[PDB]
Amino acid sequence: EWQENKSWNAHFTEHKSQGVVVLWNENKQQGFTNNLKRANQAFLPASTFKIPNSLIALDLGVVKDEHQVFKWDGQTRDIATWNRDHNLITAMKYSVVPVYQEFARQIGEARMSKMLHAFDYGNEDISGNVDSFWLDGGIRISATEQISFLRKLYHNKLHVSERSQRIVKQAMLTEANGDYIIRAKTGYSTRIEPKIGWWVGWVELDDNVWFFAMNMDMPTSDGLGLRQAITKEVLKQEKIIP
Numbered sequence: 001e002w003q004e005n006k007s008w009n010a011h012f013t014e015h016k017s018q019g020v021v022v023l024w025n026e027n028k029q030q031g032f033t034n035n036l037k038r039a040n041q042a043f044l045p046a047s048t049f050k051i052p053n054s055l056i057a058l059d060l061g062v063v064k065d066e067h068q069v070f071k072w073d074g075q076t077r078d079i080a081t082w083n084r085d086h087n088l089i090t091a092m093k094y095s096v097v098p099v100y101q102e103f104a105r106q107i108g109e110a111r112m113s114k115m116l117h118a119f120d121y122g123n124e125d126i127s128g129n130v131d132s133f134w135l136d137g138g139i140r141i142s143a144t145e146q147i148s149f150l151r152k153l154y155h156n157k158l159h160v161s162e163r164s165q166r167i168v169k170q171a172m173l174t175e176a177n178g179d180y181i182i183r184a185k186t187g188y189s190t191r192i193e194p195k196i197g198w199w200v201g202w203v204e205l206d207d208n209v210w211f212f213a214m215n216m217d218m219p220t221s222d223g224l225g226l227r228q229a230i231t232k233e234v235l236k237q238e239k240i241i242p
């Protein structure tokens with residue numbers, strides 16, 4: 001069911017880093033990773049939490065649809081793309097934390113906790129501030145747990161409406177061409193050690209789907225581009241994409 005190939009560690013060590021990639025072949029029901037231990041180590045989800053947060057906001061009516069405009073609050077932040085109006089699509093694309101902090105406040109502690117339990121999401125623990133627990137609170141999730149959650153979303157099996165799941169999968173759209181479609185979300189966790197970057201999602205092919213979840217050490221922001229580049233290089237090496 002699960003295969004470990006330690007030779008794949010080279011994808012990370014060649015960049016003076018360390019990390020884990022987890023792949024799941026949906027047709028064959030088989031998983032692959034460079035490091036079984038780290039595949040099951042739980043980290044802060046950081047901005048990968050925008051996937052469940054979006055689902056909950058939509059299903060409760062906090063967010064009406066993917067066109068609703070969330071107005072900039074006029075506070076200048078250090079990320080230029082955050083200092084503008086957003087909808088669900090662009091808020092996901094630019095990982096706009098302050099928009100999702102407001103989602104969480106309107107959702108509230110009680111409904112957030114119940115929905116994460118219903119999703120079987122990570123350790124299901126929202127301890128901390130309701131508007132920041134995915135950045136510096138008690139919630140934790142592993143790469144293998146991310147895949148389990150993403151598989152439910154793909155199949156519309158999460159305990160929210162089909163509509164809510166379709167909208168979030170639209171907002172996850174990252175890349176598409178004649179050969180494949182990638183739906184995914186990045187994450188960048190800095191407030192609790194160890195600092196890591198995430199990329200989780202899946203690759204749609206004509207006749208199969210490959211789920212993936214990766215995290216890697218991220219001592220500075222200079223390496224953030226490695227999250228997608230390394231993942232895509234693994235996918236190419238395993239002949240999942242050209």
Ligand SMILES: O=C(O)c1cccc(-c2cccc(O)c2)c1
Binds near residue numbers: 095096186
């Ligand atoms: O990697 C990203 O998609 C992303 C999107 C928005 C903000 C950031 C970010 C947040 C904090 C420090 C930093 O250098 C970059 C990263």
Ligand SMILES: [Cl-]
Binds near residue numbers: 169170173
């Ligand atoms: Cl789409």
